[PDB]
């Protein structure tokens, strides 16, 4: 899973890969990597629980739109 | 399985029983947060 | 639909254009 913001992401379909300085998620039959978003991913629960969880940044979709809303 | 296809791609235990769960249509994230629940389920229903 | 239930639907996307409008 992943730590964001205190909160454990987990993906929709497809597993984290890292290729040692970046995380992406991908497909499990095809390594085709992906930003790990919102959308690649679901949230539950903290980090507190799952056992070897590790830090990150998930983007979110919706932010550079509001940006650009609020500019 | 990925053995059971090709050539054999390793995958941590935990990840592949995510996978398990999931295909029995289990979230996977019950694992993620039950996984000393099951691991000592496993372990007792090995001993027995 | 038979069976159907009134129940309100909250989108996430609402409270987030409110709040920036607010
Ligand atoms: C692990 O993966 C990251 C992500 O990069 C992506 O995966 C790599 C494996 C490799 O295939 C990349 O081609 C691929 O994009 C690697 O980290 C770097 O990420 C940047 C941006 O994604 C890539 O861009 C390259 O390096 C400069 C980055 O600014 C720049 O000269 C070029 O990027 C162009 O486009 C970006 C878009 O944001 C723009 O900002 C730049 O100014 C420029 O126009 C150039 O393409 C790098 O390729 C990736 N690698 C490096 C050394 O920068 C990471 O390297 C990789 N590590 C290993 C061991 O695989
Ligand atoms: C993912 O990031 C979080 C937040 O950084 C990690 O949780 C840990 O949270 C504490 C406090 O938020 C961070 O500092 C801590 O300070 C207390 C003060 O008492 C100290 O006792 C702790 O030892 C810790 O230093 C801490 O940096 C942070 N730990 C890490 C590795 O980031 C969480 O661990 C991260 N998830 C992982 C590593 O799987
Ligand atoms: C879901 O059902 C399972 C039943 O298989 C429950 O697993 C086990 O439930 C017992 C009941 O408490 C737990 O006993 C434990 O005893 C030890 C003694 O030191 C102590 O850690 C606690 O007092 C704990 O209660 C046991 O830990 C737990 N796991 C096992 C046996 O592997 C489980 O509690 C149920 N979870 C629910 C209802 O949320
Ligand atoms: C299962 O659910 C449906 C609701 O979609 C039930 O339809 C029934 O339709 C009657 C209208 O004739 C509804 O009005 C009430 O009926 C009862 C008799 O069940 C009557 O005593 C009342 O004075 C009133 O007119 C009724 O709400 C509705 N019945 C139920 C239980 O919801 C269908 O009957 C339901 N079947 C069972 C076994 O629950
Ligand atoms: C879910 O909620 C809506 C809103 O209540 C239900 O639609 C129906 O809407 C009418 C008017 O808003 C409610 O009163 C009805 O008015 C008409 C026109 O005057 C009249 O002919 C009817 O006899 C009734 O008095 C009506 O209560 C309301 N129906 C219900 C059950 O609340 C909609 O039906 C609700 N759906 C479910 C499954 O609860
Ligand atoms: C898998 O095992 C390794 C080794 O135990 C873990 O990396 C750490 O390595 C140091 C020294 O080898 C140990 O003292 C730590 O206990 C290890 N940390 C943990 C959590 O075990 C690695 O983290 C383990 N990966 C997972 C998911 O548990």
Redesign the pocket.
């Given at each position: 899973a992943i730590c964001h913001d205190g909160k454990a992401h987990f993906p929709r379909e497809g597993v984290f890969v890292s290729?040692?300085?970046?995380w992406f998620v991908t497909q499990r039959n095809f390594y085709e990597?992906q930003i790990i978003t919102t959308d690649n991913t679901f949230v539950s629960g903290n980090c507190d629980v799952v056992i070897g969880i590790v830090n990150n940044t998930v983007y979110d979709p919706l932010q550079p739109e509001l940006d650009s809303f609020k500019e | 399985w990925t053995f059971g296809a090709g050539a054999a791609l390793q995958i941590p235990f935990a990840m592949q029983m995510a996978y398990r769960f999931n295909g029995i249509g289990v979230t996977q994230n019950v694992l993620y947060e039950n996984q000393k629940l099951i691991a000592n389920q496993f372990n007792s229903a090995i001993g027995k």
């Open positions: 290729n040692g300085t970046h990597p | -």
